[PDB]
């Protein structure tokens, strides 16, 4: 009974990073090496675990977070990073146990004239806690005058569009990202590698 990674990696639509998606993976055999040995991925990085030993490990549950960011932001999806993505959108903890997987999605996620669908949070007064998700759309007060829900001077919509165009430089092209978090509770393991 193999883990249904297909439903995550091959989903037609991916979330905007501010509204990142989480899927719980449970009660299955996880052949991580299939993904690790894949030619599909430009990033495959693990933390708290050896990438080559993944097929040997058991966890209570696995969580798959997925979303789109730009190429040069993939490096922010790692413990101990800062920037618009790590600070205001998707934050991994220092003690993260899991893998970060990314691939270029310019062919699916860019549009002629710019894709205005993919958003990130630009304005937030404080950084996210690890694994915090903020989907609020309150007008951001950048001065001492209240906004009263109305966009204008010093009163900003907090989300910005990437505006992905197929002609963008690679660092500015959309990348699909999957973060696998490995959860260990005091309970029987439900997700094991085939070579356990």
């Amino acid at each position, epitope marked *: 009974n193999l883990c249904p990674f297909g439903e995550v990696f091959n989903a037609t639509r991916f979330a905007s990073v501010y509204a990142w998606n989480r899927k719980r993976i449970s009660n299955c055999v996880a052949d991580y090496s299939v993904l690790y040995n894949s030619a599909s991925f430009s990033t495959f990085k693990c933390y708290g675990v050896s990438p080559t030993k993944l097929n040997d490990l058991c966890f209570t549950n696995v969580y798959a977070d997925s979303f789109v960011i730009r190429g040069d932001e993939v490096r922010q999806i790692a413990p101990g990073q800062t*920037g618009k993505i790590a600070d205001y959108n998707y934050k991994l903890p220092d003690d993260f146990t899991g893998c970060v997987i990314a691939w270029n999605s310019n062919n699916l996620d860019s549009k002629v004239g710019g894709n205005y669908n993919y958003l990130y949070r630009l304005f937030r007064k404080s950084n996210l806690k690890p694994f915090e998700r903020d989907i609020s759309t309150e007008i951001y007060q950048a*001065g001492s005058t209240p906004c009263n829900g109305v966009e204008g001077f*010093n009163c900003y919509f907090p989300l910005q569009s990437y*505006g992905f165009q197929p002609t963008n430089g690679v660092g500015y092209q959309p990348y699909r990202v999957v973060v696998l978090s490995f959860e260990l509770l005091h309970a029987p393991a439900t997700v094991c590698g085939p070579h356990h």
Partner: antibody
Framework: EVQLVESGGGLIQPGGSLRLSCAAS????????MSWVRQAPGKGLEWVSV???????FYADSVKGRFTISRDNSKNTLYLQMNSLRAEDTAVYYC??????????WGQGTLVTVSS | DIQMTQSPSSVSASVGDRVTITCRASQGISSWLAWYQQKPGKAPKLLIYAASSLQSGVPSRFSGSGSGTDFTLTISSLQPEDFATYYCQQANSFPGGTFGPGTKVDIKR
């Protein structure tokens, strides 16, 4: 009326340190992306440092390790602390408020001359 | 390591002339491109953001166009007060904005 008033530039020997100030009114410094941009005499504009509303800071490769951007909320002021200054750092330094990567308001500039 | 270039490096034009200056990014940057005017001894002033949007308070004779790698700033009818260095700026670079080298405009008469 948005105002950014800079201070603290002057003459400094090579290897010396200097702190620039930028007192803001008309927006809240701590709520904004704020940058320093410099211009060496007769040359173009060079972005040098940024501080994010949540406190993250970043620096141009040309100044990394030597400069520190900071702010004081109570004084609504932005600072740039510069160390190990060299002739290449001689420039007018501007502070600017940044909105989606563009600089809508700028200070008047402060001249830093690095010379013995 | 995007390079921003501008052309021509200088232009001399008469009052009332249409002036067209060019900015190029070495890789596509969509519409994330700003234009500034810098008078001698003054801070730059934002003219154009998002490649084509005119900043509040800026005269209507200034306009921007283009998307991707090639951008243009146009002064439709040059005024004597318009001598300056005009800079484009990539607005989506990290960690900071990336300025072009500037085009100097002077008034012919």
């Amino acid at each position: 009326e948005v105002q950014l008033v800079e201070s603290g530039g002057g003459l400094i020997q090579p290897g010396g340190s200097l702190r620039l100030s930028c007192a803001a009114s008309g927006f809240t410094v701590s709520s904004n992306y704020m940058s320093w941009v410099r211009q060496a005499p007769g040359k173009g504009l060079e972005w040098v440092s940024v501080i994010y509303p949540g406190g993250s800071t970043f620096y141009a490769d040309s100044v990394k390790g030597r400069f520190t951007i900071s702010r004081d909320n109570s004084k609504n002021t932005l600072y740039l602390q510069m160390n190990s200054l060299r002739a290449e750092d001689t420039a007018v330094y501007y502070c600017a408020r940044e909105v989606a990567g563009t600089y809508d308001y700028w200070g008047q500039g402060t001249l830093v001359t690095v010379s013995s | 390591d995007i390079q921003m270039t501008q052309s021509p490096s200088s232009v001399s034009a008469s009052v009332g002339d249409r002036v067209t200056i060019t900015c190029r990014a070495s890789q596509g940057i969509s519409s994330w491109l700003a234009w500034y005017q810098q008078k001698p001894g003054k801070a730059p002033k934002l003219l154009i953001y998002a490649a084509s949007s005119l900043q509040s308070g800026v005269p209507s004779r200034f306009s921007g166009s283009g998307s991707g790698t090639d951008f243009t700033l146009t002064i439709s009818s040059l005024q004597p007060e318009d001598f300056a260095t005009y800079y484009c700026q990539q607005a989506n670079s990290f960690p900071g904005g990336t300025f072009g080298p500037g085009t100097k405009v002077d008034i012919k008469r």
